[PDB]
Amino acid sequence: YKLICYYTSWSQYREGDGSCFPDAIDPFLCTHVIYSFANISNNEIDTWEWNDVTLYDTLNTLKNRNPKLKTLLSVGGWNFGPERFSKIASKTQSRRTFIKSVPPFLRTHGFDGLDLAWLYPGRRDKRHLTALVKEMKAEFAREAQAGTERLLLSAAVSAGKIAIDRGYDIAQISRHLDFISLLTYDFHGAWRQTVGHHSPLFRGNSDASSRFSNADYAVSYMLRLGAPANKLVMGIPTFGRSFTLASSKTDVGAPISGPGIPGRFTKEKGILAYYEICDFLHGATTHRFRDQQVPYATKGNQWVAYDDQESVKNKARYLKNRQLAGAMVWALDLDDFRGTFCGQNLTFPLTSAVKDVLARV
């Protein structure tokens, strides 16, 4: 079993305890740590944060205590316009330059692979996403001729039936990728104004519409589409999605005025770190949808959909019963990395839960 953990570059500038550096990562927790978001300039892979080469180096020292630890660098991400990604992939010349630029960079900073986070290829991209993956992978094969270990190549994909059908050739790209990380936590879209869990596990018997909105469907659709189970990794959120209620209606369906107020450390609207949710829970009412088997909480006019140790193991068990290659935890830095906010003196409680379940056969 693989446990693929993302570390976000910008969580270093979080005030107080919110601040997190590669430093705080238990090197025996995950099997793969992905440094999140490199950039691209002059069609070449490149850094993003000033001190990136330091943090790179820091993260890669962990491989000193755990010699089996593998690290990868992700390209793209959320503040990386996909158009920009598009433009580099469609011109075979700008595409070949970017590819050639990748191995030496990874080799210099000590990475073991590349993660591609093109955040959503459009209808016009499918052809090129396939080209990029096919060739990039071909370059990694030729470079291992130098006598060194072959670099890994992974991809972060959307779990929305439409986004998939629209921009991905799943049968084609599964043969070239070492593993595919499914983003099974973007289900209640940014769009609507109605309360709902962003990462429901199941179909929720109390919902006949957009049933293509849960991890369960997303997975069977990907297996159906032709991706093999031993390359599939299911994404597990270590955060919550918040909303400011527009009325005292709390239950399923309730209306919404907009996103919830910022987390005190997180400082971003509509999102909350698990450690922020732990402090939020005090004096909050907790409910759990049994249909989707996921929790949520209200307090004042704040409704929060999130995942706890239980919902998280649950997903991990499922993942095993279907025999996927592993789990992916978005935000090692959004978990209780200090272990000082959520009662128990455990560090990274959420990612531990997953790992605990992934280790019992």
Question: Where along the chain do its domains lie?
Answer: 1-238+307-361, 239-306
Q: How many CB atoms neighbour CB 253 within 10 A?
A: 11
Buried/exposed 157-189: b ≥16 CB within 10 Å, e otherwise? bbbbbebbebbbbbebbbebbbbbbbbbbbbbe
- Which CB contacts under 8 angstroms, 24+ apart, belong to 254-261? 254/194, 254/195, 254/303, 255/193, 255/194, 255/195, 256/192, 256/193, 256/194, 256/195, 256/303, 257/193, 258/193, 260/302, 260/303, 260/304, 261/302
Domain 1-238+307-361 has CATH 3.20.20.80: yes
Assign 3-state DSSP to the chain and report helix, strand, coil percentages, each to 5: 35, 25, 40
Q: Identify the helix (H) or strand (E) that includes residue 130.
A: helix 126-143
Q: Which of the listed CATH numbers 2.40.128.280, 3.10.50.10, 3.40.50.300, 3.40.50.620 matches domain 239-306? A: 3.10.50.10
Strands (DSSP E) found in 53-109: 70-76
Quote the CA–CA distance of 283 and 302 in Å, as a whole number. Answer: 12
What technique was this entry resolved by? Answer: X-ray
